[PDB]
Amino acid sequence: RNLSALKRHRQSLKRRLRNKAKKSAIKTLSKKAIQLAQEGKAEEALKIMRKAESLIDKAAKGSTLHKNAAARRKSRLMRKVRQLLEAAGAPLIGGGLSA
Amino acid sequence: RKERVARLLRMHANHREEVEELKAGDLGAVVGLKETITGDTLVGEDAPRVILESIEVPEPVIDVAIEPKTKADQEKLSQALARLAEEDPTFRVSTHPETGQTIISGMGELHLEIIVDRLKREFKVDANVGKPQVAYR
Amino acid sequence: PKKVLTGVVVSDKMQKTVTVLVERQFPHPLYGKVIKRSKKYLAHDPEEKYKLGDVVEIIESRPISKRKRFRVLRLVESGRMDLVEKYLIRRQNYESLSK
Amino acid sequence: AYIPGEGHNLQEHSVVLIRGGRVKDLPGVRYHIVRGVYDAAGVKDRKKSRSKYGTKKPKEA
Amino acid sequence: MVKIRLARFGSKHNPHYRIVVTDARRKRDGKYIEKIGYYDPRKTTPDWLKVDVERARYWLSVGAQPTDTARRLLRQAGVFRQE
Amino acid sequence: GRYIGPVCRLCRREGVKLYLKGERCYSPKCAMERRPYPPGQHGQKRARRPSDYAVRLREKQKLRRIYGISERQFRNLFEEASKKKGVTGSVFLGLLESRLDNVVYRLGFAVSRRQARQLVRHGHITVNGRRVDLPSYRVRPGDEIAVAEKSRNLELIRQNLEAMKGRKVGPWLSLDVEGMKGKFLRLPDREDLALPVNEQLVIEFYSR
RNA sequence: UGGAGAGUUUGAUCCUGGCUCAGGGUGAACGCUGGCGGCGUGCCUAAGACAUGCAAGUCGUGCGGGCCGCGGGGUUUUACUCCGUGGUCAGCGGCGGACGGGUGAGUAACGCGUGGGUGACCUACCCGGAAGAGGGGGACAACCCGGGGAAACUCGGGCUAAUCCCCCAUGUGGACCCGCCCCUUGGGGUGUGUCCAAAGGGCUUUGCCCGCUUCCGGAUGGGCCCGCGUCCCAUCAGCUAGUUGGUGGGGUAAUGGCCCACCAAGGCGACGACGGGUAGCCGGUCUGAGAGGAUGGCCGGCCACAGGGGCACUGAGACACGGGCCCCACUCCUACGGGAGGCAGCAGUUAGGAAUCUUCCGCAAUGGGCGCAAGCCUGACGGAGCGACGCCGCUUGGAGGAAGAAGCCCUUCGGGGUGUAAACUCCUGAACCCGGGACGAAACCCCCGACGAGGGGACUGACGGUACCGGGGUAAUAGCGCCGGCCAACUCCGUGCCAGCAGCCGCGGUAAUACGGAGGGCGCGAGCGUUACCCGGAUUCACUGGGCGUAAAGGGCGUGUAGGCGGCCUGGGGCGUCCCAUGUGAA
Ligand SMILES: [Mg+2]
Ligand SMILES: [Mg+2]
Ligand SMILES: [Mg+2]
Ligand SMILES: [Mg+2]
Ligand SMILES: [Mg+2]
Ligand SMILES: [Mg+2]
Ligand SMILES: [Mg+2]
Ligand SMILES: [Mg+2]
Ligand SMILES: [Mg+2]
Ligand SMILES: [Mg+2]
Ligand SMILES: [Mg+2]
Ligand SMILES: [Mg+2]
Ligand SMILES: [Mg+2]
Ligand SMILES: [Mg+2]
Ligand SMILES: [Mg+2]
Ligand SMILES: [Mg+2]
Ligand SMILES: [Mg+2]
Ligand SMILES: [Mg+2]
Ligand SMILES: [Mg+2]
Ligand SMILES: [Mg+2]
Ligand SMILES: [Mg+2]
Ligand SMILES: [Mg+2]
Ligand SMILES: [Mg+2]
Ligand SMILES: [Mg+2]
Ligand SMILES: [Mg+2]
Ligand SMILES: [Mg+2]
Ligand SMILES: [Mg+2]
Ligand SMILES: [Mg+2]
Ligand SMILES: [Mg+2]
Ligand SMILES: [Mg+2]
Ligand SMILES: [Mg+2]
Ligand SMILES: [Mg+2]
Ligand SMILES: [Mg+2]
Ligand SMILES: [Mg+2]
Ligand SMILES: [Mg+2]
Ligand SMILES: [Mg+2]
Ligand SMILES: [Mg+2]
Ligand SMILES: [Mg+2]
Ligand SMILES: [Mg+2]
Ligand SMILES: [Mg+2]
Ligand SMILES: [Mg+2]
Ligand SMILES: [Mg+2]
Ligand SMILES: [Mg+2]
Ligand SMILES: [Mg+2]
Ligand SMILES: [Mg+2]
Ligand SMILES: [Mg+2]
Ligand SMILES: [Mg+2]
Ligand SMILES: [Mg+2]
Ligand SMILES: [Mg+2]
Ligand SMILES: [Mg+2]
Ligand SMILES: [Mg+2]
Ligand SMILES: [Mg+2]
Ligand SMILES: [Mg+2]
Ligand SMILES: [Mg+2]
Ligand SMILES: [Mg+2]
Ligand SMILES: [Mg+2]
Ligand SMILES: [Mg+2]
Ligand SMILES: [Mg+2]
Ligand SMILES: [Mg+2]
Ligand SMILES: [Mg+2]
Ligand SMILES: [Mg+2]
Ligand SMILES: [Mg+2]
Ligand SMILES: [Zn+2]
């Protein structure tokens, strides 16, 4: 009747409480970073996606996400930042962009 | 037919208890039996295959009938006496299909307790007493 | 060893794609008769050079849609509109069998 | 259904196991009855087609 | 993991094993990759084993882990005997 | 268990004289003398011609009753006989003559098949120490066969080399009487293995 | 090294055509008989519901607590608190529950078989390697305390450890957007901006071993999609609106209307779309000379599901049988407040069915998982039992013994069958008893040796006191179906179109070779008849291998769409076709 393998739910909720708390910081900071690229302020979002970048690739050491998509959640961010900084954007160098 | 049966157990005063061994004289309860109904003998493996005594087959005949109290009770007596007439070893009636009054046979000759009480109390069918019919040669 | 199979253009009514059927020969596995059957293989046309009524060559690629797998590599010849009639008259022969 | 053999032992509420086949000279019958089931016992004095009509060994005396 | 073990292809009370290599996520009678060895325990047949002296170097070079009997019955074959 | 009962009964219905008792067969008391007719109280009936099924049925009896190997024991022997590559009606005869009933009996260690079947069946006649209680053994070409060392001085074996005190049996076997052994050399052919059986109308029946 | 035919329409014949039989096979069943072993198989129907037992746990070279034994100090070994070594309980954490086992309800589909692709992907424990193991902090189960709850259990205030998490220095390496070169579909390096490393433990204390992180490669297991084949019905002829296609975005490891907003009228189908019925597929199995036909019993590969449906987390790998949530139906307990829930895992119970079996023993061998090992679990499996479920093999004796004993049947009364059959002389003696005892087992574990290489030593059997060996020793089971023709085998008595046989022709009206009985004979033999299904017979769907004047058959006729084809000669392509080697057609 009883089984000692009920522990796996008590790692499932205990680690779901961590992963659910970590996955919001990718797209929340990413959409908040891509909004400021439309606003015009570049260095603010360039300060944002260093911490968001740290919360992508530093979160890529556990088991939340470390795949080719772990590179693409950052690649869509730094991809979609750089286009709209040309129509009167004055692209300076913060931390994210390499050029 | 020989099969493996045993798993011998019995009732206690309040619950069930199971025994591994059982010997002569003692009696008890057994599961796993297939089709040997009561009134029959089961013997061992290297047994002399002996059959017991007291196979109660008398031959009584009793003229009696029924009154099913309504006018459409033929289907319910014809449906209930099918499953009811199998416990009574005497079920030869030969009712002439001309009218109602579905006659049940007579074995114990006071057989309300085996047919009519087990039809009103057990099977929930109301009935009364009826009358037979003569036949001149 | 991706297969390189020749098809014919019968319709380019939808943009950025062509409706190409491929004729092929195979004997019957029981009666043994070389009969010609066809099956339409929708291919992508990014250059818009293959017009209506062409004979194209087909190479398989990574799929972009439901029911698209192939693309056009080369044209062998072109201009034979009579085979396009040899499909499309069967398109205007289906309406004569109805209620 | 058809009843084979020299008579039978059947009632109105009888459980009759069926076999099948056909009977040639009857208009609707296409079933046979195996004698040897617990409501259709075989006919006595039967020792030539004994397993076909379902009786045990005729005991000597 | 892919590793060498004994796959029993034998009848009742007549054992015969296959020194054979595939994934450990199969059953005993699984679809293997390459037949390389056989084995008869009852010692009635003098030709009771034959394990290749290059393909065992291939599978052990790409990292198969033999078990107890897959280790002793390949040790009796003599792969690691070069001195 | 192949057949137990009247065995000279099969000769009178069979026709041609059969050798299955030994001392009674070679003597003029094989019941073929003075009683030619098939058994039963019908017997000498009218001269009705047997049907074409019945003739090859009696040929199934002239291949089966003498050898004693029964029908379900026999269809498989015809099956690998047809599976072998060659004349199946000639390979099948020696193929049945590779068994420890008629290899031992053609070696002459018994007076009939009911002594070879039984004396091999109890486990006396051995293939080089490996004693075989089983006459269904397929005898290999060149197999030497001797009786048991306790069976070398029985009251029946001494009467079972009596007629074959150095008998020149044909070239499908060899024997040593003073060593009480033999050696089945090679498989016997069709005609020099001379037994009254026909070849042609057998595969015709067994293919139907 | 491969193929039977007959009965049957008619006064009689030929041809066409229908039906049946002689053969083989089953996850088969019924009846009768029944002795022993070996090897395979055992709910086909209700994928209906289930009492109870067992099937997935493991780690003290990871970590902290409670309880004992003995290692002990102001020990009355009550010692309560110093001390401390091994079990037990529970917890954090790592790995395995995606392996293995069972079923085919659903699915007509890239689901499956076959062959590839990925420039559109992953791969932990396996192996080859370039590096590392330095800092700080934090909380949660466990005990300290309290509450609630009949209970299972649950809720609050602090505590520390771990190989749990967070923040750093290091960045050889990898990743991201732009521009460069050989290939152009997202595949390889260079340059800068940023980001990402960890973890320690044990012993004999670095001599070593077990573990961890970035990354490269090779095996192995997977995901996706394509060419081909994939039941029947047209009395199912139009179907479809994320349906067809692009642009941009979100999600998956990865392409894809997988999902969303706009743009457009598209997409498929008489080469059978759509709709309905049926069905897991294949290697295989049965039959057949072959081509074919039926089917997916055991075993193996894949797919679908775990009472029906929907959904996500953890996990590399699941949308997960014994993991989680909700609805539906059902069972059980209740201190009538709330819970446990899912045997289509093994064995068993019940309903249904004619039909399907042990709540048997064990980790002795393999395999799977954990641990450095010692060892743990294995209803996978290794073995017996039950049921002649199928096959194989064997016994129920042997040699002699009469012109025919006795009993039984027929007779025209002589005789004939039973019949060498029986008793008798001799022999082997299956069962039965006594004694012995197995391959399956040498590995894991230690010793020498340089922790590898190599050699040596030690433990272990449910089967099983069984198979088997050496002797002694009893002649000791037999039935089933048929007997007019197909197709093997006939006399008498009673029945007089009644009882009955029956696959067909068809019999039984006082001589029934067709019924019941007696005898005899035939075929098989621990098996024989019967039923249901499949193939062949059947060329009776004809591709090999048929017809269309009269047996069934040419549309009432013509034009004409699609299709199938198609005069002569020359040249090219090598698509169809043929040949050679290889991959592959697993087992
Ligand atoms: Mg536990
Ligand atoms: Mg070794
Ligand atoms: Mg050695
Ligand atoms: Mg006798
Ligand atoms: Mg006519
Ligand atoms: Mg089923
Ligand atoms: Mg258990
Ligand atoms: Mg401790
Ligand atoms: Mg414990
Ligand atoms: Mg699970
Ligand atoms: Mg299965
Ligand atoms: Mg459908
Ligand atoms: Mg390693
Ligand atoms: Mg290193
Ligand atoms: Mg510190
Ligand atoms: Mg307390
Ligand atoms: Mg470094
Ligand atoms: Mg360095
Ligand atoms: Mg780098
Ligand atoms: Mg790089
Ligand atoms: Mg630069
Ligand atoms: Mg820069
Ligand atoms: Mg690791
Ligand atoms: Mg296809
Ligand atoms: Mg769709
Ligand atoms: Mg996934
Ligand atoms: Mg189905
Ligand atoms: Mg098939
Ligand atoms: Mg599934
Ligand atoms: Mg479900
Ligand atoms: Mg259920
Ligand atoms: Mg579930
Ligand atoms: Mg499972
Ligand atoms: Mg069960
Ligand atoms: Mg057990
Ligand atoms: Mg073990
Ligand atoms: Mg093990
Ligand atoms: Mg098993
Ligand atoms: Mg058995
Ligand atoms: Mg005799
Ligand atoms: Mg004697
Ligand atoms: Mg004696
Ligand atoms: Mg051990
Ligand atoms: Mg030492
Ligand atoms: Mg060694
Ligand atoms: Mg050694
Ligand atoms: Mg024991
Ligand atoms: Mg033992
Ligand atoms: Mg005697
Ligand atoms: Mg005849
Ligand atoms: Mg007849
Ligand atoms: Mg045929
Ligand atoms: Mg045919
Ligand atoms: Mg015709
Ligand atoms: Mg006419
Ligand atoms: Mg006509
Ligand atoms: Mg035309
Ligand atoms: Mg043409
Ligand atoms: Mg031409
Ligand atoms: Mg040319
Ligand atoms: Mg080609
Ligand atoms: Mg194969
Ligand atoms: Zn004779």
Short mmCIF file of all heavy atoms in Angstrom, two decimals, chain F residues 12 24 51 58 73 114-115 121-122 131, chain G residues 393-394 398 400 418 428 430 470 488 523:
data_model
loop_
_atom_site.label_atom_id
_atom_site.label_comp_id
_atom_site.label_asym_id
_atom_site.label_seq_id
_atom_site.Cartn_x
_atom_site.Cartn_y
_atom_site.Cartn_z
N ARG F 12 -1.80 -64.09 -44.42
CA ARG F 12 -2.88 -64.68 -45.21
C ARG F 12 -3.67 -63.62 -45.97
O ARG F 12 -4.11 -63.87 -47.10
CB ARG F 12 -3.82 -65.48 -44.30
CG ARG F 12 -3.18 -66.72 -43.70
CD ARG F 12 -4.15 -67.45 -42.80
NE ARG F 12 -4.46 -66.68 -41.60
CZ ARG F 12 -5.37 -67.03 -40.70
NH1 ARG F 12 -6.08 -68.14 -40.86
NH2 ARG F 12 -5.58 -66.26 -39.64
N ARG F 24 9.26 -70.54 -36.98
CA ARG F 24 7.97 -70.93 -37.54
C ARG F 24 7.82 -70.55 -39.01
O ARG F 24 7.12 -71.24 -39.75
CB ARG F 24 6.84 -70.30 -36.71
CG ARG F 24 5.41 -70.74 -37.02
CD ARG F 24 4.66 -69.69 -37.82
NE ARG F 24 3.26 -70.05 -38.01
CZ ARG F 24 2.30 -69.78 -37.13
NH1 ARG F 24 2.59 -69.13 -36.01
NH2 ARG F 24 1.05 -70.15 -37.38
N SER F 51 -9.86 -52.95 -55.69
CA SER F 51 -9.83 -51.65 -56.33
C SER F 51 -8.40 -51.11 -56.38
O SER F 51 -7.50 -51.58 -55.67
CB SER F 51 -10.74 -50.66 -55.60
OG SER F 51 -10.26 -50.39 -54.30
N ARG F 58 -2.71 -52.40 -49.95
CA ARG F 58 -1.99 -53.63 -49.62
C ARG F 58 -0.50 -53.51 -49.87
O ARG F 58 0.28 -54.25 -49.26
CB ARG F 58 -2.56 -54.81 -50.40
CG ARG F 58 -4.01 -55.18 -50.12
CD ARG F 58 -4.25 -55.70 -48.70
NE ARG F 58 -4.63 -54.64 -47.77
CZ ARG F 58 -4.67 -54.80 -46.45
NH1 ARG F 58 -4.37 -55.97 -45.91
NH2 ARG F 58 -5.02 -53.78 -45.67
N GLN F 73 4.60 -42.93 -37.30
CA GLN F 73 6.04 -43.13 -37.25
C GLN F 73 6.67 -43.26 -38.63
O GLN F 73 7.89 -43.44 -38.72
CB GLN F 73 6.36 -44.38 -36.42
CG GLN F 73 5.96 -44.30 -34.96
CD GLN F 73 6.88 -43.43 -34.15
OE1 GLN F 73 8.10 -43.46 -34.34
NE2 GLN F 73 6.32 -42.65 -33.23
N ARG F 114 10.68 -59.07 -33.70
CA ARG F 114 10.13 -59.01 -32.35
C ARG F 114 11.13 -59.47 -31.30
O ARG F 114 10.88 -59.27 -30.11
CB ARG F 114 8.85 -59.84 -32.28
CG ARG F 114 7.85 -59.41 -33.33
CD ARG F 114 6.54 -60.16 -33.27
NE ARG F 114 5.67 -59.68 -32.20
CZ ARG F 114 4.55 -60.28 -31.82
NH1 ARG F 114 4.16 -61.41 -32.40
NH2 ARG F 114 3.82 -59.76 -30.84
N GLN F 115 12.25 -60.08 -31.71
CA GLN F 115 13.41 -60.27 -30.86
C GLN F 115 14.43 -59.15 -30.99
O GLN F 115 15.10 -58.82 -30.01
CB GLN F 115 14.12 -61.59 -31.18
CG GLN F 115 13.48 -62.83 -30.62
CD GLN F 115 12.33 -63.30 -31.46
OE1 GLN F 115 12.16 -62.87 -32.60
NE2 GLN F 115 11.54 -64.20 -30.92
N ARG F 121 15.44 -53.23 -27.20
CA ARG F 121 14.59 -52.36 -26.38
C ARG F 121 14.93 -52.44 -24.89
O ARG F 121 14.87 -51.42 -24.19
CB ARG F 121 13.11 -52.72 -26.62
CG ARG F 121 12.13 -51.92 -25.78
CD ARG F 121 12.26 -50.44 -26.10
NE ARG F 121 11.49 -49.62 -25.17
CZ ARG F 121 11.96 -49.18 -24.01
NH1 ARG F 121 13.20 -49.48 -23.64
NH2 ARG F 121 11.19 -48.44 -23.22
N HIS F 122 15.31 -53.62 -24.38
CA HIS F 122 15.69 -53.71 -22.98
C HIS F 122 17.04 -53.06 -22.71
O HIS F 122 17.32 -52.67 -21.57
CB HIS F 122 15.70 -55.17 -22.52
CG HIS F 122 14.34 -55.79 -22.42
ND1 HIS F 122 13.46 -55.49 -21.41
CD2 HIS F 122 13.73 -56.72 -23.18
CE1 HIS F 122 12.35 -56.19 -21.56
NE2 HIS F 122 12.49 -56.95 -22.63
N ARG F 131 25.06 -48.03 -24.31
CA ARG F 131 23.94 -48.95 -24.48
C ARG F 131 22.67 -48.19 -24.86
O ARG F 131 22.39 -47.11 -24.35
CB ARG F 131 23.73 -49.79 -23.22
CG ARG F 131 23.32 -49.03 -21.96
CD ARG F 131 23.27 -49.96 -20.77
NE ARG F 131 22.74 -49.28 -19.59
CZ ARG F 131 23.48 -48.57 -18.74
NH1 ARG F 131 24.78 -48.44 -18.94
NH2 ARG F 131 22.90 -47.99 -17.69
P G G 393 9.21 -40.59 -33.33
OP1 G G 393 10.00 -41.06 -34.50
OP2 G G 393 7.73 -40.53 -33.41
"O5'" G G 393 9.62 -41.48 -32.08
"C5'" G G 393 10.95 -41.48 -31.60
"C4'" G G 393 11.04 -41.96 -30.18
"O4'" G G 393 10.51 -40.97 -29.27
"C3'" G G 393 10.24 -43.21 -29.84
"O3'" G G 393 10.86 -44.40 -30.29
"C2'" G G 393 10.12 -43.12 -28.32
"O2'" G G 393 11.31 -43.56 -27.68
"C1'" G G 393 10.00 -41.61 -28.11
N9 G G 393 8.61 -41.19 -27.86
C8 G G 393 7.66 -40.68 -28.71
N7 G G 393 6.53 -40.44 -28.09
C5 G G 393 6.75 -40.82 -26.78
C6 G G 393 5.91 -40.80 -25.63
O6 G G 393 4.73 -40.42 -25.57
N1 G G 393 6.55 -41.28 -24.49
C2 G G 393 7.85 -41.72 -24.47
N2 G G 393 8.35 -42.15 -23.30
N3 G G 393 8.64 -41.74 -25.52
C4 G G 393 8.03 -41.28 -26.63
P C G 394 9.95 -45.67 -30.68
OP1 C G 394 10.82 -46.65 -31.38
OP2 C G 394 8.72 -45.18 -31.33
"O5'" C G 394 9.55 -46.30 -29.27
"C5'" C G 394 10.55 -46.83 -28.40
"C4'" C G 394 10.03 -47.05 -27.00
"O4'" C G 394 9.53 -45.81 -26.44
"C3'" C G 394 8.87 -48.01 -26.85
"O3'" C G 394 9.25 -49.37 -26.94
"C2'" C G 394 8.30 -47.62 -25.49
"O2'" C G 394 9.04 -48.21 -24.43
"C1'" C G 394 8.53 -46.10 -25.48
N1 C G 394 7.29 -45.34 -25.77
C2 C G 394 6.47 -45.05 -24.68
O2 C G 394 6.81 -45.40 -23.55
N3 C G 394 5.32 -44.38 -24.87
C4 C G 394 4.97 -44.01 -26.10
N4 C G 394 3.82 -43.36 -26.22
C5 C G 394 5.77 -44.30 -27.24
C6 C G 394 6.92 -44.96 -27.03
P G G 398 4.32 -61.76 -28.10
OP1 G G 398 3.40 -61.59 -29.25
OP2 G G 398 3.94 -62.62 -26.95
"O5'" G G 398 5.72 -62.28 -28.64
"C5'" G G 398 6.66 -61.39 -29.23
"C4'" G G 398 8.08 -61.82 -28.95
"O4'" G G 398 8.36 -61.68 -27.53
"C3'" G G 398 8.40 -63.28 -29.25
"O3'" G G 398 8.70 -63.52 -30.61
"C2'" G G 398 9.55 -63.57 -28.30
"O2'" G G 398 10.77 -63.05 -28.82
"C1'" G G 398 9.17 -62.74 -27.09
N9 G G 398 8.42 -63.52 -26.08
C8 G G 398 7.11 -63.33 -25.70
N7 G G 398 6.72 -64.17 -24.78
C5 G G 398 7.85 -64.94 -24.53
C6 G G 398 8.03 -66.02 -23.62
O6 G G 398 7.21 -66.51 -22.84
N1 G G 398 9.32 -66.53 -23.68
C2 G G 398 10.31 -66.07 -24.52
N2 G G 398 11.50 -66.68 -24.45
N3 G G 398 10.15 -65.07 -25.36
C4 G G 398 8.90 -64.55 -25.32
P G G 400 8.91 -69.70 -33.67
OP1 G G 400 9.28 -69.03 -34.94
OP2 G G 400 7.63 -69.35 -33.00
"O5'" G G 400 8.93 -71.28 -33.89
"C5'" G G 400 7.79 -72.07 -33.58
"C4'" G G 400 8.09 -73.08 -32.50
"O4'" G G 400 8.56 -72.40 -31.31
"C3'" G G 400 6.89 -73.89 -32.03
"O3'" G G 400 6.64 -75.00 -32.87
"C2'" G G 400 7.28 -74.28 -30.61
"O2'" G G 400 8.14 -75.42 -30.62
"C1'" G G 400 8.10 -73.07 -30.16
N9 G G 400 7.34 -72.12 -29.33
C8 G G 400 7.20 -70.78 -29.61
N7 G G 400 6.51 -70.12 -28.72
C5 G G 400 6.18 -71.08 -27.78
C6 G G 400 5.43 -70.95 -26.58
O6 G G 400 4.91 -69.93 -26.11
N1 G G 400 5.31 -72.16 -25.90
C2 G G 400 5.85 -73.35 -26.33
N2 G G 400 5.63 -74.41 -25.54
N3 G G 400 6.55 -73.48 -27.44
C4 G G 400 6.68 -72.32 -28.12
P U G 418 -8.76 -66.71 -38.00
OP1 U G 418 -7.75 -65.81 -38.61
OP2 U G 418 -8.58 -68.19 -38.09
"O5'" U G 418 -8.98 -66.27 -36.49
"C5'" U G 418 -9.40 -64.94 -36.17
"C4'" U G 418 -10.19 -64.90 -34.89
"O4'" U G 418 -11.40 -65.68 -35.05
"C3'" U G 418 -9.51 -65.49 -33.66
"O3'" U G 418 -8.70 -64.55 -32.97
"C2'" U G 418 -10.68 -65.98 -32.80
"O2'" U G 418 -11.17 -64.93 -31.97
"C1'" U G 418 -11.75 -66.31 -33.85
N1 U G 418 -11.94 -67.75 -34.10
C2 U G 418 -12.94 -68.39 -33.39
O2 U G 418 -13.64 -67.81 -32.58
N3 U G 418 -13.10 -69.72 -33.67
C4 U G 418 -12.37 -70.47 -34.58
O4 U G 418 -12.63 -71.67 -34.72
C5 U G 418 -11.36 -69.74 -35.27
C6 U G 418 -11.18 -68.44 -35.02
P U G 428 17.11 -63.90 -18.20
OP1 U G 428 18.45 -63.87 -17.56
OP2 U G 428 15.92 -64.27 -17.40
"O5'" U G 428 16.84 -62.48 -18.86
"C5'" U G 428 17.64 -62.02 -19.94
"C4'" U G 428 16.95 -60.93 -20.72
"O4'" U G 428 15.76 -61.45 -21.37
"C3'" U G 428 16.43 -59.77 -19.89
"O3'" U G 428 17.43 -58.84 -19.52
"C2'" U G 428 15.37 -59.17 -20.81
"O2'" U G 428 15.98 -58.41 -21.84
"C1'" U G 428 14.78 -60.44 -21.44
N1 U G 428 13.54 -60.90 -20.75
C2 U G 428 12.34 -60.30 -21.08
O2 U G 428 12.25 -59.41 -21.91
N3 U G 428 11.24 -60.78 -20.41
C4 U G 428 11.22 -61.78 -19.46
O4 U G 428 10.15 -62.10 -18.94
C5 U G 428 12.49 -62.35 -19.17
C6 U G 428 13.57 -61.91 -19.81
P A G 430 13.42 -54.27 -18.19
OP1 A G 430 13.24 -53.90 -19.61
OP2 A G 430 14.75 -54.07 -17.55
"O5'" A G 430 12.36 -53.45 -17.34
"C5'" A G 430 12.50 -52.05 -17.15
"C4'" A G 430 11.38 -51.29 -17.81
"O4'" A G 430 10.35 -52.22 -18.24
"C3'" A G 430 10.64 -50.29 -16.94
"O3'" A G 430 11.31 -49.05 -16.84
"C2'" A G 430 9.27 -50.20 -17.61
"O2'" A G 430 9.33 -49.36 -18.75
"C1'" A G 430 9.07 -51.64 -18.08
N9 A G 430 8.32 -52.45 -17.10
C8 A G 430 8.80 -53.51 -16.38
N7 A G 430 7.91 -54.07 -15.59
C5 A G 430 6.76 -53.33 -15.82
C6 A G 430 5.46 -53.42 -15.30
N6 A G 430 5.09 -54.33 -14.39
N1 A G 430 4.54 -52.53 -15.74
C2 A G 430 4.91 -51.61 -16.65
N3 A G 430 6.10 -51.43 -17.21
C4 A G 430 6.99 -52.33 -16.76
P G G 470 25.14 -49.35 -15.59
OP1 G G 470 25.93 -50.10 -16.60
OP2 G G 470 23.66 -49.32 -15.69
"O5'" G G 470 25.50 -49.92 -14.15
"C5'" G G 470 26.85 -50.19 -13.78
"C4'" G G 470 26.92 -50.78 -12.39
"O4'" G G 470 26.43 -49.81 -11.43
"C3'" G G 470 26.05 -52.01 -12.16
"O3'" G G 470 26.69 -53.20 -12.58
"C2'" G G 470 25.77 -51.96 -10.66
"O2'" G G 470 26.87 -52.49 -9.94
"C1'" G G 470 25.71 -50.46 -10.41
N9 G G 470 24.34 -49.92 -10.40
C8 G G 470 23.78 -49.13 -11.37
N7 G G 470 22.56 -48.76 -11.10
C5 G G 470 22.29 -49.34 -9.88
C6 G G 470 21.11 -49.29 -9.09
O6 G G 470 20.05 -48.71 -9.34
N1 G G 470 21.25 -50.03 -7.92
C2 G G 470 22.38 -50.71 -7.55
N2 G G 470 22.31 -51.36 -6.38
N3 G G 470 23.48 -50.77 -8.27
C4 G G 470 23.37 -50.06 -9.42
P A G 488 -12.14 -48.54 -51.68
OP1 A G 488 -11.21 -48.65 -52.83
OP2 A G 488 -13.60 -48.68 -51.89
"O5'" A G 488 -11.72 -49.63 -50.60
"C5'" A G 488 -10.38 -50.07 -50.49
"C4'" A G 488 -10.07 -50.53 -49.09
"O4'" A G 488 -9.63 -49.41 -48.28
"C3'" A G 488 -11.26 -51.10 -48.32
"O3'" A G 488 -11.52 -52.45 -48.65
"C2'" A G 488 -10.86 -50.89 -46.87
"O2'" A G 488 -9.98 -51.93 -46.44
"C1'" A G 488 -10.06 -49.59 -46.95
N9 A G 488 -10.83 -48.40 -46.53
C8 A G 488 -12.15 -48.08 -46.77
N7 A G 488 -12.52 -46.94 -46.26
C5 A G 488 -11.38 -46.47 -45.64
C6 A G 488 -11.10 -45.30 -44.91
N6 A G 488 -12.01 -44.35 -44.67
N1 A G 488 -9.85 -45.13 -44.42
C2 A G 488 -8.93 -46.08 -44.66
N3 A G 488 -9.07 -47.22 -45.33
C4 A G 488 -10.33 -47.35 -45.80
P G G 523 -5.75 -52.26 -42.65
OP1 G G 523 -4.72 -52.43 -43.70
OP2 G G 523 -5.73 -53.13 -41.45
"O5'" G G 523 -5.72 -50.74 -42.17
"C5'" G G 523 -5.83 -49.68 -43.09
"C4'" G G 523 -6.15 -48.38 -42.39
"O4'" G G 523 -7.52 -48.41 -41.90
"C3'" G G 523 -5.32 -48.07 -41.16
"O3'" G G 523 -4.06 -47.51 -41.48
"C2'" G G 523 -6.22 -47.14 -40.37
"O2'" G G 523 -6.17 -45.82 -40.89
"C1'" G G 523 -7.60 -47.72 -40.67
N9 G G 523 -8.06 -48.67 -39.64
C8 G G 523 -8.14 -50.03 -39.77
N7 G G 523 -8.60 -50.64 -38.71
C5 G G 523 -8.82 -49.60 -37.82
C6 G G 523 -9.32 -49.65 -36.49
O6 G G 523 -9.65 -50.64 -35.84
N1 G G 523 -9.40 -48.38 -35.93
C2 G G 523 -9.05 -47.22 -36.57
N2 G G 523 -9.20 -46.08 -35.87
N3 G G 523 -8.59 -47.16 -37.81
C4 G G 523 -8.50 -48.38 -38.37
#
